[PDB]
Amino acid sequence: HPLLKKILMKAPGTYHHSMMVANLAEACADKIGANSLLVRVGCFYHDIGKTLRPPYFVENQINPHDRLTPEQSRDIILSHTKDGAEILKENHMPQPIIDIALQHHGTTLLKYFYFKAKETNPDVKEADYRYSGPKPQTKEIAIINISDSVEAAVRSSTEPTMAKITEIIDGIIKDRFLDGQFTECDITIQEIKIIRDTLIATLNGIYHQRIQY
Ligand SMILES: Nc1ncnc2c1ncn2[C@@H]1O[C@@H]2COP(=O)(O)O[C@H]3[C@@H](O)[C@H](n4cnc5c(N)ncnc54)O[C@@H]3COP(=O)(O)O[C@H]2[C@H]1O
Ligand SMILES: [Fe+3]
Numbered sequence: 001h002p003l004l005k006k007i008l009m010k011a012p013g014t015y016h017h018s019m020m021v022a023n024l025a026e027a028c029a030d031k032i033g034a035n036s037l038l039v040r041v042g043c044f045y046h047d048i049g050k051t052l053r054p055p056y057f058v059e060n061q062i063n064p065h066d067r068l069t070p071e072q073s074r075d076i077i078l079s080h081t082k083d084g085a086e087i088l089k090e091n092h093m094p095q096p097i098i099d100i101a102l103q104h105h106g107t108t109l110l111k112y113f114y115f116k117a118k119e120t121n122p123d124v125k126e127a128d129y130r131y132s133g134p135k136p137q138t139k140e141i142a143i144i145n146i147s148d149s150v151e152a153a154v155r156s157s158t159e160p161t162m163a164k165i166t167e168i169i170d171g172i173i174k175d176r177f178l179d180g181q182f183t184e185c186d187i188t189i190q191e192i193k194i195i196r197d198t199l200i201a202t203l204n205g206i207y208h209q210r211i212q213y
């Protein structure tokens with residue numbers, strides 16, 4: 001598997017992140033009866049677009065964005081879905097793996113740099129700081145979108161207790177619902193609740209369970 005080792009060698013922080021997302025998303029897919037094998041493998045590759053400029057993504061970092069404008073930061077980060085899909089395409093990967101790379105942020109807002117730009121232009125359009133999408137077209141991809149955000153959010157949190165983990169997850173699911181990111185797939189509100197509880201249980205295992213005979 002040349003591609004997966006390319007992520008490992010060029011972007012080991014990203015590599016590590018993707019394996020962790022794969023475990024969380026697979027658990028969720030299992031629990032609602034979705035395509036868990038597809039979810040696992042698609043997570044391996046979802047961030048491969050980051051291999052083009054590894055140090056401009058925080059998990060691979062000294063921050064080179066300090067010497068960049070919001071617009072420049074934006075152009076680099078928003079590209080990684082498109083570039084990832086392009087790489088997988090050129091490497092003749094299965095289409096659903098390619099779709100995961102392209103759609104895993106749906107059309108979400110790149111909040112940090114959006115608000116950094118809004119500091120000096122109150123008229124900045126959200127449109128200019130959103131991924132191109134498409135919005136997740138399947139349950140599997142909705143699952144990945146949430147799991148990816150939860151992994152990263154909990155990993156950067158200070159003291160992720162159960163309550164803290166629960167609040168992080170609920171906040172992400174709230175934002176994705178309100179922002180309409182799941183209106184183009186078949187995921188049910190009950191399934192979202194099952195995903196939420198599964199992520200809570202799984203992260204409880206990962207962050208707090210004593211490993212014992
Ligand atoms: N504390 C938190 N609370 C709630 N949600 C959270 C969170 N931390 C991360 N997320 C979510 O997790 C996503 C991680 O996306 P990715 O694995 O491509 O990893 C990130 C990361 O590699 C990079 N990145 C984001 N902000 C950065 C910054 N200020 N400096 C350097 N790299 C950054 O760009 C990628 C895409 O970022 P984006 O923000 O669109 O997407 C974020 C965001 O939607
Ligand atoms: Fe990503």
Ligand SMILES: [Fe+3]
Nearest residue numbers: 017046047148
């Ligand atoms: Fe990711």
